[PDB]
Design a protein around this ligand. Structure first.
Ligand code: EQP
Ligand code: K
Length: 381
């Protein structure tokens, strides 16, 4: 409802641990230093829930991180904040939970918010460097859920570690970043990225995990090419279509056999250029009559580097393959320490449609209401 607000302020937030003691970060006055990787979900009550890495000491990936959650019930004007998932606190310099992917769904009639993050404790190198073990012993992928509209989160005892181990060719797995989805048949789907074991020629692959109850998960038999691995999936008729990060042009593939084989999807394949290094992007579908339109956000990256400037909203015509820039909502050069990520959230509650975005803005996480752009996006079919 509000047009724009700051969800998490770099060097402006103070969080407390499980015992009620304040977490003294490296920010001014002992605040959390930097926020990254925003994920957002809107509920049937109109509640906006935002998750993000609370990188307490540094913006670097291998650092002390907790998953923060902010909840707004007044259209994004004010935010109630807290830590949703705490890292294990084994290593004060490296313990972390990171890269959230959320899903808002109705599981057997109960509206649930699921959040999945990767967890590490002693690894001091980038996750893609660990390929000797199946899986890496330092790694874990945890899932938390909220059944009270984002107020409290609880760990879900899942079989995810089991399926990865059983596969035997996966060193580590992570969510695609941003948001997953609930299919028409009710199944929950989390797009995933995976680092394969050393013997596999392809270092990274993309796929997804699915579940009916959110407790028992499955992995399909096939694998999609990895590229920059971060990705989102959308349901289009009887297909699952992904949108993957890649240095240069984004890639898009579709499965018509539920994860067994993937072929490039022309309407979205190589349509948006993120330039050097690539960036994570959010891709969701928006209904228009009895048709669908895909809305997407990622950085134009005008400096062709890690600054990832100009985080923009695009509309993808799934039928014709046309693409159009709808709005450059953050037309600024980002902080090379960590920038460019975003997450879109569309929802139609009763007769009210809303389109929101959450994105990285120089260490902080900002929110913008993009609903005014819906008529233009919805006409792209
Ligand atoms: C688990 C993890 O490391 N996530 C980080 C990834 C990852 O290192 C790369 O995607 C290579 O796998 O990098 C991005 P970015 O630096 O491109 O902004 C920040 C993420 O927090
Ligand atoms: K990185």
């Amino acid at each position: 409802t509000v047009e724009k607000s700051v969800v998490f302020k770099a060097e402006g937030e103070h969080f407390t641990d499980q015992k009620g003691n304040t977490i003294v970060g490296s920010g001014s006055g002992g605040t959390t230093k930097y926020f990254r990787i925003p994920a957002m979900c809107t509920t049937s009550k109109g509640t906006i829930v935002v998750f993000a890495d609370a990188r307490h000491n540094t913006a670097s990936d291998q650092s002390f991180i907790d998953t923060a959650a902010a909840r707004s019930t007044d259209g994004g004007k004010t935010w109630n904040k807290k830590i949703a998932i705490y890292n294990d606190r084994v290593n004060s310099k490296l313990s972390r939970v990171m890269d959230p992917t959320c899903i808002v769904a109705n599981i057997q009639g109960r509206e649930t918010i699921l959040v999945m993050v990767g967890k590490w404790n002693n690894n001091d190198k980038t996750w893609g460097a660990y390929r000797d073990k199946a899986p890496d012993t330092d790694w874990d992928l945890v899932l938390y859920k909220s059944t009270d509209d984002g107020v409290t989160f609880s760990k879900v005892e899942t079989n995810i570690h089991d399926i990865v181990t059983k596969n035997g060719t996966i060193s580590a797995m992570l969510g695609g970043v941003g948001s997953g989805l609930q299919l028409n048949d009710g199944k929950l789907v989390f797009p995933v990225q995976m680092v394969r074991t050393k013997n596999i020629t392809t270092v990274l692959n993309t796929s997804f995990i699915y579940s009916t109850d959110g407790i028992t998960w499955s992995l399909p038999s096939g694998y999609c090419e990895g590229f920059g691995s971060e990705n989102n999936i959308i349901e289009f008729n009887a297909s699952l279509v992904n949108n993957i990060r890649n240095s240069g042009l984004r890639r898009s593939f579709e499965t018509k056999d539920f994860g067994k084989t993937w072929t490039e999807f022309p309407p979205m394949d190589k349509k948006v250029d993120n330039r050097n290094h690539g960036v994570q992007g959010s891709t969701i579908t928006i209904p228009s009559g009895n048709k669908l339109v895909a809305a997407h956000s990622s950085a134009q990256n005008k400096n062709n580097d890690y600054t990832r400037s100009d985080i923009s909203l695009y509309a993808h015509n799934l039928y014709s393959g046309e693409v159009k820039l709808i709005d450059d909502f953050y037309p600024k050069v980002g902080n090379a320490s960590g920038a460019g990520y975003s997450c879109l959230s569309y929802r139609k509650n009763v007769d009210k449609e809303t389109l929101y975005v959450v994105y990285e803005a120089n260490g902080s996480i900002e929110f913008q209401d993009l609903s005014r752009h819906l008529p233009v996006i919805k006409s792209y079919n």
